[PDB]
């Protein structure tokens with residue numbers, strides 16, 4: 001929506017054991033979607049300015065079109081410095097559908113971002129292109145288990161072997177885990193049993209306005 | 224002109240030939256080619272069966288996305304095997320992983336039709352194309368192949384083993400047959416055996432060879 005300016009919503013990512021909020025996924029050249037990125041960082045530093053969300057990470061969905069456009073890191077780097085955001089506080093979620101040439105260029109960008117203290121995550125994991133291959137080449141930090149897998153996690157026994165295998169990969173690759181699409185208590189408890197404690201989903205929390213997040217972050221926890 | 228090429232698939236424990244993947248030595252282009260291959264491979268395959276060799280092995284044939292998802296394809300394959308007296312379960316059609324969304328989910332019905340004919344189905348180059356992880360549970364494919372990339376530098380490359388270790392577990396859950404491709408080094412062969420994959424293809428195991436040469440190999444039954 002437009003208020004003359006962009007109205008972003010923020011999907012909280014929580015520790016499911018404690019209920020504690022650990023991060024917030026910001027939801028909504030030619031494609032100057034750094035406008036989204038810029039708005040999120042501004043709203044994020046605002047929380048930080050108010051002594052809230054100091055220890056949490058801001059997650060922004062970044063396109064591969066957005067990525068590897070020359071002077072992409074210059075913006076991400078500058079944008080963070082602009083709003084006094086410290087290292088590790090921003091994590092760019094990249095789609096698994098990289099499906100891009102210059103895999104070296106992609107790798108130099110990701111390492112480039114790490115030099116600038118920016119984490120990277122694979123969004124919608126298991127649904128894109130070259131799912132398993134990417135794990136070898138790209139120095140990412142976080143994995144995000146797609147809606148698809150978490151949806152019927154408890155109900156279908158057939159989802160668990162897959163999820164158990166994905167968790168193994170993350171563990172084996174030294175990658176942080178996040179489950180997205182937790183809409184049931186069954187999936188919730190199953191993710192906990194097998195060692196996936198970070199998650200997002202309608203059961204846990206809904207996309208909320210910047211002000212609403214700041215309030216939630218003031219508590220620092222949810223049921 | 225072109226000619227068929229056969230990459231044998233062996234049990235790395237014994238050295239016994241369990242199957243042979245038909246390859247070509249170097250409406251749509253590939254649509255015609257693969258349909259020719261299917262017929263020629265099956266023809267050449269029955270010639271072995273006639274000579275009493277490879278009587279109980281599988282013939283693996285790569286199927287293009289265009290050949291599949293054509294009305295009459297499933298019935299056509301049956302028509303090929305009826306013709307060359309190939310028995311039930313003696314053919315396994317490899318399909319590239321990037322057919323999940325590249326074709327409609329009626330793929331499920333195609334497989335269902337193919338299983339009724341007595342035709343196995345393998346997922347080639349797994350983890351490289353558009354992933355099927357979402358639908359592996361719902362898909363009745365029989366075999367699952369470990370792509371060349373994860374096998375090539377297996378052991379030396381640290382990223383390979385976890386991926387190989389993962390895919391094995393998946394196949395084990397859904398009752399899928401595990402075949403490794405691109406086994407270049409004994410280092411790779413050694414790990415696969417230790418981690419639970421005995422079927423494999425590779426230059427180390429056996430080079431791709433002609434139909435006549437395959438007969439000779441099948442007559443022996445093994446490689447060293």
Ligand SMILES: [Mg+2]
Pocket residue numbers: 025061093123124144180
């Ligand atoms: Mg996301």
Ligand SMILES: [Mg+2]
Pocket residue numbers: 244285317347348
């Ligand atoms: Mg193949």
